[PDB]
PDB file of C-alpha atoms and ligand atoms in Angstrom:
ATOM      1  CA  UNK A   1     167.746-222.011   6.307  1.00 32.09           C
ATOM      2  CA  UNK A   2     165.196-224.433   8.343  1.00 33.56           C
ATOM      3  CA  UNK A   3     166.726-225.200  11.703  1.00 30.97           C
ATOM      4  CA  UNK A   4     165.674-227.564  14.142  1.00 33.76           C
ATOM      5  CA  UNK A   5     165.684-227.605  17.466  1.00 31.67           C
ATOM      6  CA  UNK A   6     166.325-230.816  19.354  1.00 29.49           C
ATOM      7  CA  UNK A   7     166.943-231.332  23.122  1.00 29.11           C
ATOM      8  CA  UNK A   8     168.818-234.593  24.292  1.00 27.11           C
ATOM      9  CA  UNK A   9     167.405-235.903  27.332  1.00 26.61           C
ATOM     10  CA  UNK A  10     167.337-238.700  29.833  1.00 29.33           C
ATOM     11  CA  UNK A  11     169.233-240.452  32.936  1.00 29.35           C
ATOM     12  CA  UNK A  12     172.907-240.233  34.052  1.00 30.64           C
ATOM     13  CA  UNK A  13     174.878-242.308  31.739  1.00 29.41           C
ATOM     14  CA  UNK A  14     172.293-243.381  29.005  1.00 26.94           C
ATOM     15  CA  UNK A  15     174.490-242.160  26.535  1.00 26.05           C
ATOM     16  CA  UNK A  16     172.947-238.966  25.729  1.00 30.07           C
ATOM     17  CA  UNK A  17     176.580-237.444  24.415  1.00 29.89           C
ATOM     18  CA  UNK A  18     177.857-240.680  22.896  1.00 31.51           C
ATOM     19  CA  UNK A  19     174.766-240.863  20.474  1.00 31.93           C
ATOM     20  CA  UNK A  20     175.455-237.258  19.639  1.00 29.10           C
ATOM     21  CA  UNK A  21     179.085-237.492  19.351  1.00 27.09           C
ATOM     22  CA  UNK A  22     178.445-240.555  16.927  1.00 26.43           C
ATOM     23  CA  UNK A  23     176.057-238.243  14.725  1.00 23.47           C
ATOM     24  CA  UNK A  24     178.447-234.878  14.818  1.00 22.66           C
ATOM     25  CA  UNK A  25     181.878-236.245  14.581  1.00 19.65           C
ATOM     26  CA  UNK A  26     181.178-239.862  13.705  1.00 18.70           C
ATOM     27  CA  UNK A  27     183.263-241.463  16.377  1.00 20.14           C
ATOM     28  CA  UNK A  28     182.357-243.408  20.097  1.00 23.30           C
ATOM     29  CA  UNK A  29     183.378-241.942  23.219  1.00 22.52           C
ATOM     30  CA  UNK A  30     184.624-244.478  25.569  1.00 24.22           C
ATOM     31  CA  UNK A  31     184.776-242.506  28.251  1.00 19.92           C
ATOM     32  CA  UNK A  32     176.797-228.777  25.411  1.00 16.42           C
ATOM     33  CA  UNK A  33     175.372-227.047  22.195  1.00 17.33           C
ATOM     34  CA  UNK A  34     176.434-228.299  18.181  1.00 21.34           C
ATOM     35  CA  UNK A  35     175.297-227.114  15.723  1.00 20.12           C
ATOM     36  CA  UNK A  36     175.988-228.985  11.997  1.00 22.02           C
ATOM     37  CA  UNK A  37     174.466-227.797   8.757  1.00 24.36           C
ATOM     38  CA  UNK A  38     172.773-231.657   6.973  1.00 21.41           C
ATOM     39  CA  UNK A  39     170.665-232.368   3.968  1.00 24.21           C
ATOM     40  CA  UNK A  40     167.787-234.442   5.316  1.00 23.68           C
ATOM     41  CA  UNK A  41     165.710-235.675   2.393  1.00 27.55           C
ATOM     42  CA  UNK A  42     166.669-233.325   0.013  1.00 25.89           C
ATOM     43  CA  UNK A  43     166.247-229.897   2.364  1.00 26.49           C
ATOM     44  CA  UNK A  44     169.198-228.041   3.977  1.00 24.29           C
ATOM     45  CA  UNK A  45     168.921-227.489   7.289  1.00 25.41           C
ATOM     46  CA  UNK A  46     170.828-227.042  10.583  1.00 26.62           C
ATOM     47  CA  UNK A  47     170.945-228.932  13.864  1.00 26.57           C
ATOM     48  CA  UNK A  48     171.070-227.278  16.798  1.00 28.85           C
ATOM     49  CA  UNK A  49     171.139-229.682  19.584  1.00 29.05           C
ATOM     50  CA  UNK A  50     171.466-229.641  23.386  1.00 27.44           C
ATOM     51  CA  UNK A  51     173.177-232.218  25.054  1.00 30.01           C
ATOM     52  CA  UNK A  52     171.986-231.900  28.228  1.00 27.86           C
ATOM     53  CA  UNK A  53     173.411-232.611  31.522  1.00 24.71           C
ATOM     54  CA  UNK A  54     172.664-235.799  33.580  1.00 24.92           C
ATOM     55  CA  UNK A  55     172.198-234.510  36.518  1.00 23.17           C
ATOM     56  CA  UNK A  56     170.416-230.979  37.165  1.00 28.69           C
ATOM     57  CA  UNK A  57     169.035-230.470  40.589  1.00 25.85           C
ATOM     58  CA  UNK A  58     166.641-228.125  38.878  1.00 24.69           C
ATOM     59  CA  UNK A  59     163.765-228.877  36.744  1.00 23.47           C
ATOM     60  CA  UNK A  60     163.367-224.723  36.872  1.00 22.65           C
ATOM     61  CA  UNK A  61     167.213-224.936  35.140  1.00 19.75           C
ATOM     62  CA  UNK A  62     165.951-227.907  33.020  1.00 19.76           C
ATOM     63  CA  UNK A  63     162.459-225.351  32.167  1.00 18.40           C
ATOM     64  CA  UNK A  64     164.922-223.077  30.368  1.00 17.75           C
ATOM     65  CA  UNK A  65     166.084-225.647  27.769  1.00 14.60           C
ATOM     66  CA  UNK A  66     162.949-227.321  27.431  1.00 15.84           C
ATOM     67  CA  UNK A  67     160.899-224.404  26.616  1.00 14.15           C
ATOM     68  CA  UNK A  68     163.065-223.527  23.174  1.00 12.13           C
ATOM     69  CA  UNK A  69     163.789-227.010  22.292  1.00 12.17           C
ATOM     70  CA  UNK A  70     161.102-227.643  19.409  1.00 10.48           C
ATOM     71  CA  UNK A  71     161.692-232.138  19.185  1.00 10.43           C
ATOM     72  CA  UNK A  72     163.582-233.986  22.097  1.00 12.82           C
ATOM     73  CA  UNK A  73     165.187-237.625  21.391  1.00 11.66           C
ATOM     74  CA  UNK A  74     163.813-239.180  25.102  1.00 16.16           C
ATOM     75  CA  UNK A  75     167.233-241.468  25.812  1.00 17.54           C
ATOM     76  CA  UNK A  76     166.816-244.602  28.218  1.00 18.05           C
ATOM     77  CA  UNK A  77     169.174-247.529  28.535  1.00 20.28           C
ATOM     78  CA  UNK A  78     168.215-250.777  27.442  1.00 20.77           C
ATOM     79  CA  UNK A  79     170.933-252.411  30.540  1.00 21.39           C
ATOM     80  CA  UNK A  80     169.415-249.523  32.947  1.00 21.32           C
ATOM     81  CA  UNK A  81     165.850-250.405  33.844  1.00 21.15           C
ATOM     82  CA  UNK A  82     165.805-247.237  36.250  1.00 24.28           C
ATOM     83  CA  UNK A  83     166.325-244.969  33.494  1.00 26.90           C
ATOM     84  CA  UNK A  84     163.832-246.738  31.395  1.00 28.94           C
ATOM     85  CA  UNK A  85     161.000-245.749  34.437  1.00 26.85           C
ATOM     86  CA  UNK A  86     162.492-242.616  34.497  1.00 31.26           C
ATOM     87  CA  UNK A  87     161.543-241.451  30.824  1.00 27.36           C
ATOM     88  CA  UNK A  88     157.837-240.698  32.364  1.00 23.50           C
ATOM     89  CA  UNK A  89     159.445-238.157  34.431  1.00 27.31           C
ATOM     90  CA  UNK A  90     161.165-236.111  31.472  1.00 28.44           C
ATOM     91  CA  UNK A  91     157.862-236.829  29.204  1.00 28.47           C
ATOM     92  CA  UNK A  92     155.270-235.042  31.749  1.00 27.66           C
ATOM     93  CA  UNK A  93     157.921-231.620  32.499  1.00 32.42           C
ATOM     94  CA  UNK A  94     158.385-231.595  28.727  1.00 30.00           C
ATOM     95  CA  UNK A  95     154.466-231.666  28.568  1.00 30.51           C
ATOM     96  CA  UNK A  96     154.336-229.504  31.466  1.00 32.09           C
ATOM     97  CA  UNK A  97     156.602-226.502  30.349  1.00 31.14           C
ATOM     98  CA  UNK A  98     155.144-226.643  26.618  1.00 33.79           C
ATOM     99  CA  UNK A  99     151.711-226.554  27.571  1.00 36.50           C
ATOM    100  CA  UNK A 100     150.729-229.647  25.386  1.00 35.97           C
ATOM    101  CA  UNK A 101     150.024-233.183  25.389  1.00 34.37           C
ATOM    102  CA  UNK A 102     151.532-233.902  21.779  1.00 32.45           C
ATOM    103  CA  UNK A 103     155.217-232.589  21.646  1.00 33.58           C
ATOM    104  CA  UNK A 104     157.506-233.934  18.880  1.00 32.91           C
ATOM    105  CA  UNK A 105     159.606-236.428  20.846  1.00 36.65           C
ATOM    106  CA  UNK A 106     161.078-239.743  20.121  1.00 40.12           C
ATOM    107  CA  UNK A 107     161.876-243.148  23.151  1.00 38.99           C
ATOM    108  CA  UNK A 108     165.203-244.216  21.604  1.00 39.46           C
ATOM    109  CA  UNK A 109     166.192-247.381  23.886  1.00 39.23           C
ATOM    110  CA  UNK A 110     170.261-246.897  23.580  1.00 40.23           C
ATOM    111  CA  UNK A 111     173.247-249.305  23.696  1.00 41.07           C
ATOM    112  CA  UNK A 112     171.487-252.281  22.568  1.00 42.56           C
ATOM    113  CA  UNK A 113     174.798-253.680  21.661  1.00 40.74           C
ATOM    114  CA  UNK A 114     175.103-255.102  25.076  1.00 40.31           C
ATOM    115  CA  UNK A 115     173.730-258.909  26.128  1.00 37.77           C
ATOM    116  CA  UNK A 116     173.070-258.135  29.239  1.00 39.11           C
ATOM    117  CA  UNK A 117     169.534-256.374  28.400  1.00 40.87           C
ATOM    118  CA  UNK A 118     166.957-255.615  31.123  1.00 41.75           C
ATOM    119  CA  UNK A 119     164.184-253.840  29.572  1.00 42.42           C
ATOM    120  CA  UNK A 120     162.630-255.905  27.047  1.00 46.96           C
ATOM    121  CA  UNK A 121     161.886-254.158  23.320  1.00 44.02           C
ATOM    122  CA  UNK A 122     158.223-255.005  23.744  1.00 45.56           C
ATOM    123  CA  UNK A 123     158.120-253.279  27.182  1.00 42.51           C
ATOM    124  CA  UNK A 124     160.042-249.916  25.403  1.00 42.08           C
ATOM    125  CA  UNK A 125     157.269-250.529  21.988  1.00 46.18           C
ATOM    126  CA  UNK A 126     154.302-250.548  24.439  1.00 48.81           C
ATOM    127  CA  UNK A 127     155.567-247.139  26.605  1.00 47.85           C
ATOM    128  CA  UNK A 128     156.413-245.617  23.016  1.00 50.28           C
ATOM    129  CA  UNK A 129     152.537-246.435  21.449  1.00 47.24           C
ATOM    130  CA  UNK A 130     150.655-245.373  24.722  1.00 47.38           C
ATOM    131  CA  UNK A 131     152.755-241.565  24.400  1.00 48.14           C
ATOM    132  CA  UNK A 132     151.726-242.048  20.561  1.00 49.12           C
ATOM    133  CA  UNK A 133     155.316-241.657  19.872  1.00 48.17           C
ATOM    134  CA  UNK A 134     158.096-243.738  17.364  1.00 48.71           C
ATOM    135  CA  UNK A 135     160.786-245.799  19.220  1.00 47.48           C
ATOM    136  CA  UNK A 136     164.082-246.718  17.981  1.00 48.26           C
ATOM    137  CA  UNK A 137     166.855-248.734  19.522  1.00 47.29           C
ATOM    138  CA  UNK A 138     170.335-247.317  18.980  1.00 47.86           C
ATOM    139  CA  UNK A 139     173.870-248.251  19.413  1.00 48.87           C
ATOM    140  CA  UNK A 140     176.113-245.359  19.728  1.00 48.09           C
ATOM    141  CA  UNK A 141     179.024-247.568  19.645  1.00 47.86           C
ATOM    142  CA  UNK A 142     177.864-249.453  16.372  1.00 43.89           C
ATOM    143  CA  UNK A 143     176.020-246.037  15.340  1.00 42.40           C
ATOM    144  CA  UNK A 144     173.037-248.561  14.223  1.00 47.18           C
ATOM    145  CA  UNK A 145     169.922-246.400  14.663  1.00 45.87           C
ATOM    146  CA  UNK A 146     171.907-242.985  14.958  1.00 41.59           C
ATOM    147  CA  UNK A 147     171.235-241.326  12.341  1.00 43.01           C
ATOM    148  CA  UNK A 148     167.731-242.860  12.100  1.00 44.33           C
ATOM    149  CA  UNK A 149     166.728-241.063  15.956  1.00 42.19           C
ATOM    150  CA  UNK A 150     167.505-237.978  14.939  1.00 38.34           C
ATOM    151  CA  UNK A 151     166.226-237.656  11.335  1.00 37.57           C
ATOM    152  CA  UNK A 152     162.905-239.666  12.923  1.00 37.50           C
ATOM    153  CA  UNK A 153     163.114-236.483  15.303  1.00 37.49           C
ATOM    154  CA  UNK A 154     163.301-233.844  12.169  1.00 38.40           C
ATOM    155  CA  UNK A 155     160.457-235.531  10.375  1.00 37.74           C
ATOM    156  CA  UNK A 156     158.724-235.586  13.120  1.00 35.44           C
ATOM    157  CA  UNK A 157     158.561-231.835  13.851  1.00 35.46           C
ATOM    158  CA  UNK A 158     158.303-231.248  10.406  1.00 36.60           C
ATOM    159  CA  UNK A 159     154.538-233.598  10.959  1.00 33.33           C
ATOM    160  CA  UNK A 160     153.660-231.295  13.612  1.00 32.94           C
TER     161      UNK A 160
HETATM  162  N1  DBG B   1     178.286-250.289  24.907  1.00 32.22           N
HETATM  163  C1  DBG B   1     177.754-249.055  24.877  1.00 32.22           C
HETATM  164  N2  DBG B   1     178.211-248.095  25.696  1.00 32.22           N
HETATM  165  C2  DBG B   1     177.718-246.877  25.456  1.00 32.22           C
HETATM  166  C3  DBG B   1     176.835-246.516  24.485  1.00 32.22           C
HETATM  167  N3  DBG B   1     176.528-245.148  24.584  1.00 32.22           N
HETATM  168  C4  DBG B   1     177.232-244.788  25.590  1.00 32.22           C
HETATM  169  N4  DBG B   1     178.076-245.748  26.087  1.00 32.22           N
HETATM  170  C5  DBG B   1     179.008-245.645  27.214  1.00 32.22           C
HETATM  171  O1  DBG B   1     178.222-245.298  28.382  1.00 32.22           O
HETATM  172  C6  DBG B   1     178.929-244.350  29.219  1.00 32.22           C
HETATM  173  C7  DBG B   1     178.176-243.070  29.332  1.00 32.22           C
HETATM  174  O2  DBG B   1     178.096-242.448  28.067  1.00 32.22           O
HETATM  175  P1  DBG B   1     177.774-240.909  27.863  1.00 32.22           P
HETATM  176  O3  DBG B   1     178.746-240.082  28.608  1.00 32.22           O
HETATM  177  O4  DBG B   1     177.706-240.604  26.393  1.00 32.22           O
HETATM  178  O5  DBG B   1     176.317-240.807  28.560  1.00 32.22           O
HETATM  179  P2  DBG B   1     175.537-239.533  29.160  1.00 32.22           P
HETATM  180  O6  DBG B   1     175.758-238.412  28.249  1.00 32.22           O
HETATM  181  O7  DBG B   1     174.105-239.897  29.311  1.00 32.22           O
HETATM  182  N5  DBG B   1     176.262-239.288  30.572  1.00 32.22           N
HETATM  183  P3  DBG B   1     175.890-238.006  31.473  1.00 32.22           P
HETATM  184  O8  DBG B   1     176.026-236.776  30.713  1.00 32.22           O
HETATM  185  O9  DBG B   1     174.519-238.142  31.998  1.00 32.22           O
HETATM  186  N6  DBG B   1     176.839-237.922  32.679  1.00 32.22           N
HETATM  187  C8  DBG B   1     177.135-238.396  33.929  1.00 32.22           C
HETATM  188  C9  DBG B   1     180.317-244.198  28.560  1.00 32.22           C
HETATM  189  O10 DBG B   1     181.243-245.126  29.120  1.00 32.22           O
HETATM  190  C10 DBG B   1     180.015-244.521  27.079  1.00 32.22           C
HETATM  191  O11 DBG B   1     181.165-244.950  26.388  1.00 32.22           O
HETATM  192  C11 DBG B   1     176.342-247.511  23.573  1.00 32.22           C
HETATM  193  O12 DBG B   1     175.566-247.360  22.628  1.00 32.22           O
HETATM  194  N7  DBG B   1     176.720-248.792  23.955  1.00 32.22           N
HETATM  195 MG1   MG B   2     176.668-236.387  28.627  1.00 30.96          MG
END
């Protein structure tokens, strides 16, 4: 069958696992490869998704992963505003290593559960239509917008 590959990326502690956790096993962690066979509007197809690591020390051991991947769901938190200025980082070495200015990718603004918000949804909406890319805001703990992130991702490399 189709399978897509999608790469998981984004600061320490944005929540990269939870939101696939949520979308794999439907439960939140409180406190990596998978690979699930879905129906996505009608076709079969498998996931194959890399939840990356937070911290790498690379960007030649962060090349590897980002060379294969094929869509990447681009993970900020909306509480974080560090990790929201860091998505501009992962964006141009994702350019970088796939030698192209249009790569499928998605700016999913995560844990918008919380109050205490410091980067605004315009701000995120803004960053997402200069890249020319769709952003969604996601709760892994909810799972509002789960399932909508990654089948946005899907579709998305299906457009390309
Ligand atoms: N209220 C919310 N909390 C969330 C949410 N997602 C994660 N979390 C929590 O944030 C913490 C980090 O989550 P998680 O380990 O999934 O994030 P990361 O994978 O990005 N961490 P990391 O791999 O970079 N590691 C260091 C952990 O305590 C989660 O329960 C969410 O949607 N809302
Ligand atoms: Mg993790």
């Amino acid at each position: 069958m189709t399978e897509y590959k999608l790469v998981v990326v984004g600061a320490p502690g944005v929540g990269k696992s939870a939101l696939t956790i949520q979308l794999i096993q439907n439960h939140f962690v409180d406190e990596d490869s998978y690979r699930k066979q879905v129906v996505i509007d009608g076709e079969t197809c498998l996931l194959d998704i890399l939840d990356t690591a937070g911290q790498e020390e690379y960007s030649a051991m962060r090349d590897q992963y980002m060379r294969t991947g094929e869509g990447f769901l681009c993970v900020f938190a909306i509480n974080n505003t560090k990790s929201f200025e860091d998505i501009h980082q992962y964006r141009e070495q994702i350019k970088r290593v796939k030698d192209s200015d249009d790569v499928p990718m998605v700016l999913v603004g995560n844990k918008c559960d919380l109050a205490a918000r410091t980067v605004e949804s315009r701000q995120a909406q803004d960053l997402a239509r200069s890249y020319g890319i769709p952003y969604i805001e996601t709760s892994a703990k909810t799972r509002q917008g789960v399932e909508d992130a990654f089948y946005t991702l899907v579709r998305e490399i299906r457009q390309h």
